Amino acid sequence: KTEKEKFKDSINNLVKTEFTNETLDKIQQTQDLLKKIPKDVLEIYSELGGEIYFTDIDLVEHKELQDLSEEEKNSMNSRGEKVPFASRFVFEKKRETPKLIINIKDYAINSEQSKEVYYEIGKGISLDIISKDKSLDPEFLNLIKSLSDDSDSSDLLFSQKFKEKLELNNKSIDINFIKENLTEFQHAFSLAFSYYFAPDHRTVLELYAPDMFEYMNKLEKGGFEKISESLKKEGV
């Protein structure tokens, strides 16, 4: 490794020698975004019946398939509670079948925008990993039990209202509390999904909540494939 080679790969990504088009590079960056979640997650989303679309620049519903139709009726879909639909770039249409609309942006350069995509993907496939038939698949119930009050630094996975309600009820194992706040359970799973698969900060989940990391690691090392082939064999 001479000085010339060290300088030559010091500027390996600063010189874009083949650019030639503006919206042809956003497409390559969106493809490189989506190609690093594993194959089993995408195949679970297809066996559920899901769609993913790389639309052009039309933020509010100029998109003809997310057009003036069935839509969100809420106050919170980000990691906070904004939903200012003029300034969104990912939405999921899941009424009769799942369908994900991903606007194309510069995802290799922005890493905060590149996390809402994984958050909505994990929101989409939440109810088929968090449950088996109509339940909470009680490994996940033991997980939320182990993260409820046993760690003050596992409030990165819960909302504010879910935290105060789980504080007030304080013994939530019953099926009364489970079906009253299932959206918060999906929120916790999807937020751990986005923290696990964003490349820059996975170790924040490994540090501040070390047992959710084990759940996600076993998922990635074969639970996704298991639930995929289960839904496949049920599909025939």
Binding site: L14, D155, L156, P199, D200, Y208
Partner: protein, 541 residues
């Protein structure tokens, strides 16, 4: 692997979108800004530039600054990636002695001085102001110490064909944010305008001692450095002929131009953590790069002394200096000096931001007037969180209450606050006065004038001399002491009638005189004074 272009240790996306260094179980951890769990513990959200190894161009990294793997003498506000760490050392002169060049026990004159760091601006209208140099002016005491000493030239006994020698005690002082380790700078002593008397060149590496920030080199519990006193390898005195002595007695003022040659830089060594002076690094390599890519701000809120800090701002013509984060004026004040907003109002220890005065050079005033034009506002104190800073700006925040001379030193206030400052009496007597005057107000008072008034009203000034105003003394408990006995032959105030009135006057540093007037005027006739004290003779006892 993660991309890291500048090669300091922090990945790019963290440096662009925010990061902080948290301490888990006991180990440290460099994490992105999770707003839920990092805001509770009171951590700071950092931002840097992903293509500079040191965003403020100072010789410490971004990683080293945020994680604490730095020299521990580096000032605490220079632990931020956006505040530069560099030394600003000048020379403090304590007292001088003057004698003729050769029985010389009464043929000398010994006076105390007063040294302050200067920021020489432009002349008003009848002659870009702010430039990079360390200089300070001294102020030899014009008043008397003995009973009847007078007439400096005749006190020393000089004629036209005589030369005088100079000797003084100096002390270096580092008011920057980084320490010097072996080398001391080479100051020169300038009289008048360009008449350089001597160059002080205290020999390097006869010391090995540290000049930390906010500290003196011969520390305050040691003895000062004497100018040309010991003669070990200094066979030359500091000579001064009669003409220069005449200008020195006319002005009673000198100047000490200190240059910027410092030593080496002490850097953290990653194998055993030993901070060791590196012979490769040098401050001469670093200081121009700091001076070209940052925006200085000068402030005198803590006391009436100027403090210079430099904050790393963008520069729109440069592609590498468009990488640094956006710096507003409010954030620069909050991270460099120590301002905070308790309720929503930016204030520096109680004093609100509207009590301070903004001054720029020409370029900055143009640059900021254009921002106020396109922001559609007229008050800079309202939009203080939207004024973007760029590189090579120069701002000067100073206090509104006072009046400043050419060197931006506080030399006087208006009358109303001087009268308000003296409305706390602890004890009153015919021997003196006990008051709680504030420490900043009492820095602009040259001395006092005491007089006695008849019951019908008369004007009898006790100490009717220009060199007899130093009747104030300060005790360490924090309470001043005026004294009538100092120029009344050690005898108290002679009250003739208990229904008399006592009148004490105050003269600020812009109004006092240092030399008698053209004919013989050692009188306090044409001196602008201020009513401070008016009680009766039956109330002081």
């Amino acid at each position: 692997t993660v991309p890291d272009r500048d090669n300091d240790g922090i990945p790019d996306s963290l440096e662009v979108e925010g990061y902080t260094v948290d301490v888990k179980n006991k180990r440290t951890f460099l994490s992105p800004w999770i707003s839920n769990i990092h805001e509770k513990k009171g951590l700071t959200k950092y931002k840097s530039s992903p293509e500079k190894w040191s965003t403020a161009s100072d010789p410490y990294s971004d990683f080293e600054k945020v994680t604490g793997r730095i020299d521990g003498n580096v000032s605490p506000e220079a632990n931020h990636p956006l505040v530069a760490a560099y030394p600003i050392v000048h020379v403090d002169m304590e007292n001088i002695i003057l004698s003729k060049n050769e029985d010389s026990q009464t043929r000398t004159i010994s006076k105390n001085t007063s040294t302050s760091r200067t920021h020489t601006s432009e002349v008003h209208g009848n002659a870009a102001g702010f430039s990079n140099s360390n200089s300070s002016t001294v102020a030899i005491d014009h008043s008397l110490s003995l009973a009847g000493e007078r007439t400096w030239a005749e006190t020393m006994g000089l004629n036209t064909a005589d030369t005088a020698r100079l000797n003084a005690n100096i002390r270096y002082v580092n008011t920057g944010t980084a320490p010097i380790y072996n080398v001391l700078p080479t100051t020169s002593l300038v009289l008048g305008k360009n008449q350089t008397l001597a160059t002080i060149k205290a020999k390097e590496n006869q010391l090995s001692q540290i000049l930390a920030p906010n500290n003196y080199y011969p520390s305050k519990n040691l003895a000062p450095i004497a100018l040309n006193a010991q003669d070990d390898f200094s066979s030359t005195p500091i000579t001064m002929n009669y003409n220069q002595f005449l200008e020195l007695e006319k002005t009673k003022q000198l100047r000490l131009d200190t240059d910027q040659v410092y030593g080496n830089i002490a850097t953290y060594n990653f194998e055993n953590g030993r901070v060791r002076v590196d012979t490769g690094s040098n401050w001469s390599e670093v200081l121009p790069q700091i001076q070209e890519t940052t925006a200085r701000i000068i402030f005198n809120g803590k006391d009436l002394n100027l403090v210079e800090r430099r904050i790393a701002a963008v520069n729109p013509s440069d592609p590498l200096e468009t990488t640094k984060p956006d710096m507003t004026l409010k954030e620069a004040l909050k991270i460099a000096f120590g301002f905070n907003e308790p309720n929503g109002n930016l204030q520096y220890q109680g004093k609100d931001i509207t009590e301070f005065d903004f001054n720029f050079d020409q370029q900055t005033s143009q640059n900021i007037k254009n921002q106020l034009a396109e922001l559609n506002a007229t008050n800079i104190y309202t939009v203080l969180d939207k004024i973007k800073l760029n590189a090579k700006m120069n701002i000067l925040i100073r206090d509104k209450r006072f009046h400043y001379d050419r060197n931006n030193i506080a030399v006087g206030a208006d009358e109303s606050v001087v009268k308000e400052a003296h409305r706390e009496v602890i004890n009153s007597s015919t021997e003196g006065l006990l008051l709680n005057i504030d420490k900043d107000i009492r820095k602009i008072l040259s001395g006092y004038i005491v007089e006695i008034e008849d019951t019908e009203g008369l004007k009898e000034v006790i100490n009717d001399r220009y060199d007899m105003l130093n009747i104030s003394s300060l005790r360490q408990d924090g309470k001043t002491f005026i004294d009538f006995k100092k120029y009344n032959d050690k005898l108290p105030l002679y009250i003739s009638n208990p229904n008399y009135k006592v009148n004490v006057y105050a003269v600020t540093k812009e109004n006092t005189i240092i030399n008698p007037s053209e004919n013989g005027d050692t009188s306090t006739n044409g001196i602008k004074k201020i009513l401070i004290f008016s009680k009766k003779g039956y109330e002081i006892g």
